């Protein structure tokens, strides 16, 4: 069936790996390398194609933030460049609505973006939309009921517990209920119509706690914590379960992949990546 793809990441330098995990049989497959190494990117899927968005190439030869959008077709095992964003976005967050990719926040050098732009695959074109109310890098992004949510992050000075949401039909952002915890570099995704925020950095320590937002009650509630605290993790959903991949915990680069089963409210470590890394892009198709 569908596979969990992880692209890029960092360990000693930004990485070029593309690897796919099959949860059904527990196997990993190494696929075509990214054309340029990337960490701090985000992954998403539209129409069966995997996109790698933003990030940076941090190596001993220097750092270059990325405005790149690249597309991987599992059917060809090839990467194809697409149109670049208006600005480089390291530690970007992305979400998909109506088959368009929204690129949210991130940084370019010391600039922490509030800007947001939208990609239309059929036209290979990016368009700026209304900026967020807050500058946010290491921002978690998810889509619920065709609204875009931007959760936590770092504004250039402070790590954030705030969250906001974007209504495309009005092209407007509004603040929602703040999280219980400050989280920069959390994994944020939607599962069964709730927005989950897992891990992150609270300004002092990495987190293993996980909370979920219900738009109906406007409340964030804690669920079972992950076994391993982590920030700059990748998060995705496969067959109704959340998977978190890698990250950093202040001491090590995680290879751990943990799986959250909402039906039992438990996490387990289901596999490990081929090597420890943070700042991966991850998506499922």
């Amino acid at each position: 069936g569908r596979l969990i793809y992880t692209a890029g990441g960092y360990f000693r330098q930004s990485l070029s790996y593309l690897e796919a995990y099959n949860p059904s049989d527990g196997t990993w497959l190494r696929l075509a390398d990214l054309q340029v190494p990337r960490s701090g990117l985000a992954g998403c899927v539209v129409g069966g194609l995997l996109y790698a968005v933003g990030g940076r190439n941090n190596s001993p030869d220097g750092n270059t933030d990325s405005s790149a959008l690249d597309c991987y077709n599992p059917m060809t095992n090839q990467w194809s460049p697409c149109a670049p964003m208006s600005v480089p976005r390291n530690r970007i967050g992305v979400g998909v609505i109506d088959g368009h990719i929204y690129a949210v926040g991130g940084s370019h050098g010391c600039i922490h973006h509030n800007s947001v732009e939208r990609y239309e695959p059929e036209r290979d074109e990016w368009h700026l939309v209304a900026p967020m109310l807050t500058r946010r890098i290491g921002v978690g992004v998810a889509v619920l009921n065709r609204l875009l949510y931007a959760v936590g992050g770092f504004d250039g000075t402070n790590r954030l517990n705030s969250a906001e949401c974007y209504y495309p039909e009005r092209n407007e952002w509004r603040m929602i209920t703040a999280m219980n915890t400050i989280r920069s570099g959390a994994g944020v995704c939607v599962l069964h119509n709730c927005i989950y925020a897992a891990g992150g950095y609270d300004g002092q320590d990495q987190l293993n706690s996980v909370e979920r937002y219900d738009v109906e009650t406007e409340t964030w509630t804690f669920v079972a914590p992950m076994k391993h605290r982590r920030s700059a993790l990748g998060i995705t959903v496969h067959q109704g379960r959340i998977y978190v991949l890698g990250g950093y915990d202040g001491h090590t680069f995680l290879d751990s992949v943990e799986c959250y089963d909402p039906d039992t409210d438990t996490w387990s470590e289901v596999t490990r990546m081929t090597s420890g890394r943070s700042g991966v892009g991850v998506a499922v198709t």
Binding site: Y10, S39, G40, N58, N63, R91, G138, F154, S184, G185, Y201, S231, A232, Y248, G250, F253, S278, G279
Partner: peptide, 16 residues
């Protein structure tokens, strides 16, 4: 301009 030592990112673990 001064070839400064790299600094650790507390959130990502990257050195820059």
């Amino acid at each position: 301009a001064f070839f400064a030592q790299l600094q650790l990112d507390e959130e990502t673990g990257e050195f820059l």
